[PDB]
């Protein structure tokens, strides 16, 4: 349930800062690593999208008038970073809401059924929701085709 960021390093003990913002001491063995959400989504008071590595201001919450850089994000929590803050090694945590702004067709064999390339046959190398890349069996070229002009050839 609780995920934190290690803010201080010592010989024996650890001082890991959890989401709630308090400081709890743990050992090396007990604490196990967790991967970082390189991509995620959240919500804010302004109702605007917020991603990591964005400068934000804590206009409300545990801290007031505080500026930091996001390093990790949680469903309802986010970890801010700084260099001017003595307390907690410059890293604190505040709520996300309180923060404010400051493929199935790939590899199949298709027949182009409409348009100037009608009749040609190829293998789909890449398909978005609307358009596909088809390597043509006969021309040494890969072309982009609207997916509405394709029919998969069945065995």
């Amino acid at each position: 349930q609780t995920v934190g960021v290690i803010v201080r390093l010592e010989r024996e003990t650890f001082q890991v800062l959890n989401m709630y913002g308090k400081v709890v001491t743990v050992r090396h063995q007990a604490v196990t690593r967790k991967k970082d959400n390189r991509f995620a989504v959240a919500l804010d008071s302004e109702q605007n999208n917020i991603h990591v590595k964005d400068i934000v201001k804590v206009i409300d919450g545990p801290h007031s008038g505080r500026e930091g850089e996001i390093r990790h994000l949680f469903r309802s929590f986010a970890f801010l970073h700084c260099k001017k803050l003595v307390e907690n090694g410059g890293m604190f945590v505040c709520k996300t809401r309180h923060l404010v702004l400051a493929n199935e067709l790939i590899g199949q064999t298709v027949r182009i059924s409409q348009g100037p390339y009608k009749g040609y046959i190829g293998v789909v190398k890449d398909a978005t929701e609307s358009t596909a890349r088809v390597e043509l069996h006969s021309t040494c070229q890969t072309i982009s085709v609207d997916r509405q002009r394709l029919t998969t050839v069945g065995s």
């Binding site: 064999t109 040609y120 046959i121 069996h137 021309t139 050839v153």
Partner: protein, 46 residues
């Protein structure tokens, strides 16, 4: 699963299993060729 190969000497089809060494069951030749694909091959006649 079958994986049919053609012998280079006697032209005999014969089954081969991955991890099985290459050797014609008839004449013992060690060179074999894969058979043409069953995938659809279509050419413009240009």
């Amino acid at each position: 699963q079958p994986m049919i190969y053609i012998c280079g000497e006697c032209h005999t089809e014969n089954e081969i299993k991955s991890r099985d060494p290459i050797r014609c069951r008839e004449c013992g030749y060690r060179i074999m060729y894969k058979k043409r694909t069953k995938r659809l091959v279509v050419f413009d006649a240009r």
